[PDB]
DNA sequence: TTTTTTTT
């Protein structure tokens, strides 16, 4: 277009910030807060900061997609060196079953049944493994409860979603099974801010079962059908002991790696027994 | 009169966007991220490229008429080849009568009932036609349950409009009459703004009764001549087979294509039934 | 007053918008496209043509008035061949008799005694024949339903305001009551701001009984009175099939001129006898 | 300070619009439509005349008041020129007494009883004689029962107020009680805007029972002794005559002098004997 | 730093606001129109007036405390010259001991207990002497019901803060739980704003009933343990006066010279006795 | 990176803004309101300040952490100067026990159980012990029991939060479970604006009981054992003396330096028993 | 050649 100074100065920044991947503003100040101080100085308004950092989003969406996030450059083949196998199976869910199971769900195997739902408590190796998950991808979303006007706030274009305990209302059942079913859909913000969603992976961390409609007093079942076919189920309990947490992302690789080079086919099971 | 460079550069921008039929954002940038940085990195404020989205959907909505890009230009000359056909033959819904309800329903027809009624679940055989409707239309609106001010904040004159079931006040079944019967009327946006909603083809995906106005405890339905006078219906509970599934454009065009052409006389018929 | 050079540019540019009779941006569009080219050659801000937008509608609504130009020179010559006529004939009202209400509701010959009242069944398409009415005229407004906030957004210094179906809440009735009840009087407009009304026509869409005043659950009779002391009492029944609506705007300009062209005496009658 | 000559025609323009004491526009706009037009060519700033108009306005409201306004120019001595002393006499409330009940309550002579209460609808014409008065002053305020926030948007820093009718919630009853008090009490708007309010003359516009403590859904009677203390009593139910009312600036003036050139002492009576 | 032409004129200006003791806008207008007039049109954007009045408020609240704007020059000595002293006489209590109880609080001493409970409608004048209190310091506060959900918007960085008669539902009762305390603490002001309010004078005036828990629809002592162990206690019950009202600033300021001058050691009484 | 005279005031700004340690504004002011006005007087815009108080909190949110801001230098060896020391004597506490809890609580040990939960009335001084430790750390946040919609507004990156007494309802329960389990987790703000939560310590300071969930009107004690294992149990009911409070952070220095200099080994335990 | 803010 112009491509003068401000121009050049502009895209040697883009591509200073995108070189290594870069959307937090915390990311970029243990980076390089001489230059984050620099180009805080170098600029009136913070604006320009937002609108790259939003590019740089976008493009580590649209290009880089979720799986090549999961890619192992070297496997270990053990079964006692990573936790996650023991919890596995300790409950008797197959390791490979379960492999496969997450292999299809983050490559979209099936798309219509892309939900990952858990039960039991969340202090049984559910939390820290969701947090050790979305520590390990850079994009992430969840679905918190204290915003009432739009509960989906935090999920604009990510690579995972996160789904907590919490009996939805029925303002927002139509809203959820459209965003589980999987599908491209444009949704609103606020105020003038509409933007889309593409199929991703999502994960529901609850404790209870949500499947039944409970909206305060009222337990309907009538969307019952429809929401257990959207879902899968992940039912679980074991009673997980302490000193533990905190699952490294070299794990969550090696069972990625494993995963991919031991590719099973599952049938729909709704219901998954605990064999293996 | 000035014709300046600015006025220059916005009309070759103008021209490019308008060149392949671009005028969102993840689809530019997945065309020409490096020409998105440079003119991000040219203009130093963002109402410029807003005011071009803004002009460049208006012209796109006040131009050419949907099917215009929505037609096919061959025919397919079968019946279990395409999946909504398929789907339409296990029904029980006649392919020609559906195709003639279409074409009179896109090319709007009646105006007055201009209604596409799902009744049923929508894990039934709707996700798979729901999925092809939307990825058929570039820009279309929605109208979504989670805004608690203006249920359509993404309809600014789009070519078809989307909807959902769930509990309806009075207010969005008003604002649902009105667009029914086909009027360009002018309400607020959300806060301090306004624009004038002109008459679009809507399609409903609704799971329960949506004739019914459900609010809380609150169950009315006194008003169910008109609605079910001013809209028609197509009621299937058919099950869908997994492993196919995500119909793409082609076969919606091919159902385009062989509506155009075998012209079909459209009654005047509310309950549709399961023959042919 | 200071006498400059956009002075003059701006001046030119609003006698040019005056002359074309643009009000908005459908008719901005749909008069040439190179309005948009043209506006970007010479400035590049929305606020100007807002600003322009708003004192030609101030202009063109204080020079002139609705019947300066509601009233043309080319009669209807036929007085069977009219949609109107027709409709009022089928449904048994005297023709001069609403002839002359509707002339004197034009003139506000009373004052606290004007208001547009359709009750009746919804089976005959009363809102085709509003949305033609609305669509006639080219400066009125619309009562918002959607928020409780300014739901008088669109009527502002209007000519002609509608109201929706059904009932609504005191505080907005007060409103309206305060607005249709003969009165120029000022409220807040948007967010911090103030515009004031004067004694316009209102007309009443709802075909349900709106003198039960329902507060969302309880059902109030103590603004029933007053509330039918401000305009004339209008009941019709009739049952209609298809080919309604949607009519010119030239056949509103000659039923106009034939019911100017007689004049009936009309007392203080609440209730519209249907004699003649 | 400054001196010169953008702050000049500022001033300048100031000096002419204060020059004939009209706030308004339509009456410039009536008076040479070409200087308006000229003015607001000239006026791109955004901003000139927002400040004008707020100096305006603070000019007009810091040197004089509203009541001093409405002197008499030439006393007519006559009882059927004025149209509100035929009220009074149908009503049979003494015509002296009101007259100096009003002419204390607009002079401030009680200071703390500064406040009229009135009851009845549309058919005793008490909205009719609010909006002549209304329209008498050139500077006026109203309670509006639509907005939830702050309902006293529109009454900050005015002349007279009118409180519109509506039963009081307890959000509004301790603002009432502040403002029949009279002080400078600061409040804020909606978002980030404070002003001091000044002691001013309120007035109570209701057509039912206001005084019956009514929030929401309880129903009590004890805060009705202060609102009784503070303020006296004018109720009175007549029908109007035929199509009455329309009162203008001068039969308010001549009522004026008249109650100045006979003053009768008015204790703190509450309830007003009837004789006249 | 650079000493230019604007910054000794808002230098010069901010002087002269913390000379005179000017924060608002009509105080500035009084003190000189000229120079309010010449401000607003040397500058377009306004936003350097509004700096200058927050920075002079900073300036006042952190320089001058509360008991400096308390303080006299010129004491008086006598008890039939105040007509605060008759009010709080006619019930019993005793002069001194107010005096003292009240130089404590203004002192913060306790710190803990620096809430009075003071018990009586409007009848006993207490309306009167808090506008005379809130009149006499520039900064105040007012615990209005004006205000949503947040009341206080005017008692940021204040001084003296006067409570108001009102059932606090669960909404701010732990907020002015957590303020009696004597406890600075970051919260939250209106909406997207925040503040850090520190241990500042408070009176809270009860007309009714005000200790009891009611949150919502609950009627509960759970928190009134901790309150009345915060608070002390001060019942008066007297009916006022005619032609009384509207205390001076002099008196107050007298008052509270001569309970500075003499000092009496105020221990913990809760049950405050009528004598003395 | 430009490197001009404005990026370098800018860097020397932000240098002698952060060399000590500056939280909000007023510090800056009441440390030097001369380079505060010299800073002023040098720009115009109001945004220098903000982002430079902005960034000062990031660095010191990002680089600091809490202990750094608890430990002492030398010990004082007193057993009757500390406060703690007796509260817990008098209630029965282990010192050391205690101490090395509360020191890999601050340190960040334990990780799942990183909280701190108290029961017990406020009437004890718990409220004097809250704000000593409160001023102890430099930035912390409360949750403001105000706003409904969001009451963790001041806890976004925050060292320590507050948790005031209040019902647990359903519509925050999940917040504050996610909140317990520690986790950088994205929120939304107030209006259009997120930010991720670093996982920081919480102390409740109720004084009801926190194991029934309670949401107002309704009472559930099923989902119970995550949040009533993921804290410990510190709870006290002796009362101290009159008017005993207003603690420094020298005590609180000394008696980490103590808790350092005998370090205790932790274990995971939930009510905590009485042997010291 | 210089700039603007939203809900029970």
Same mark, same amino acid.
């Given at each position: 277009? #112009?491509? $003068?100074? &401000?121009?050049?100065?502009?895209?040697? *920044? @883009? %591509?200073?910030?995108?070189?290594?991947? /870069?959307? +937090?503003?915390?990311?970029?100040?243990?980076?390089?807060?001489?230059?984050?101080?620099?180009?805080?100085?170098?600029?009136?308004?913070?604006?320009?900061?937002?609108?790259?950092?939003?590019?740089?989003?976008? #493009?580590? $969406?649209? &290009?880089?997609?979720?799986?090549?996030? *999961? @890619? %192992?450059?070297?496997?270990?083949?053990? /079964?006692? +060196?990573?936790?996650?196998?023991?919890?596995?199976?300790?409950?008797?869910?197959?390791?490979?079953?379960?492999?496969?199971?997450?292999?299809?769900?983050?490559?979209?195997?099936?798309?219509?049944?892309?939900? #990952?739902?858990?039960?039991?408590?969340?202090?049984?190796?559910?939390?820290?493994?969701?947090?050790?998950?979305?520590?390990?991808?850079?994009?992430?979303?969840?679905?918190?409860?204290?915003?009432?006007?739009?509960?989906?706030?935090?999920?604009?274009?990510?690579?995972?979603?996160?789904?907590?305990?919490?009996?939805?209302?029925?303002?927002?059942?139509?809203?959820?099974?459209?965003?589980?079913?999987?599908?491209?859909?444009?949704?609103?913000?606020?105020?003038?801010?509409?933007?889309?969603?593409?199929?991703?992976?999502?994960?529901?961390?609850?404790?209870?079962?949500?499947?039944?409609?409970?909206?305060?007093?009222?337990?309907?079942?009538?969307?019952?059908?429809?929401?257990?076919?959207?879902?899968?189920?992940?039912?679980?309990?074991?009673?997980?002991?302490?000193?533990?947490?905190?699952?490294?992302?070299?794990?969550?690789?090696?069972?990625?790696?494993?995963?991919?080079?031991?590719?099973?086919?599952?049938?729909?099971?709704?219901?998954?027994?605990?064999?293996?």
């Amino acid at each position: 277009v #112009i491509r $003068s100074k &401000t121009s050049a100065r502009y895209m040697e *920044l @883009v %591509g200073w910030l995108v070189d290594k991947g /870069i959307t +937090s503003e915390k990311q970029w100040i243990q980076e390089d807060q001489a230059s984050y101080i620099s180009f805080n100085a170098a600029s009136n308004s913070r604006s320009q900061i937002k609108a790259a950092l939003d590019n740089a989003g976008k #493009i580590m $969406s649209l &290009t880089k997609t979720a799986p090549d996030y *999961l @890619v %192992g450059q070297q496997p270990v083949e053990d /079964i006692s +060196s990573n936790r996650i196998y023991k919890i596995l199976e300790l409950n008797g869910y197959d390791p490979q079953y379960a492999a496969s199971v997450f292999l299809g769900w983050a490559t979209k195997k099936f798309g219509k049944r892309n939900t #990952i739902w858990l039960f039991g408590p969340a202090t049984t190796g559910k939390t820290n493994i969701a947090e050790a998950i979305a520590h390990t991808v850079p994009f992430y979303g969840c679905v918190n409860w204290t915003n009432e006007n739009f509960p989906f706030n935090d999920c604009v274009d990510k690579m995972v979603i996160w789904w907590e305990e919490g009996k939805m209302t029925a303002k927002v059942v139509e809203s959820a099974k459209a965003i589980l079913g999987g599908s491209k859909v444009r949704v609103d913000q606020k105020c003038k801010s509409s933007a889309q969603i593409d199929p991703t992976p999502v994960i529901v961390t609850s404790n209870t079962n949500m499947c039944a409609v409970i909206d305060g007093n009222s337990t309907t079942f009538e969307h019952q059908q429809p929401l257990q076919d959207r879902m899968f189920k992940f039912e679980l309990t074991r009673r997980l002991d302490h000193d533990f947490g905190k699952v490294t992302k070299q794990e969550v690789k090696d069972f990625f790696r494993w995963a991919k080079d031991h590719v099973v086919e599952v049938e729909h099971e709704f219901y998954v027994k605990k064999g293996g």
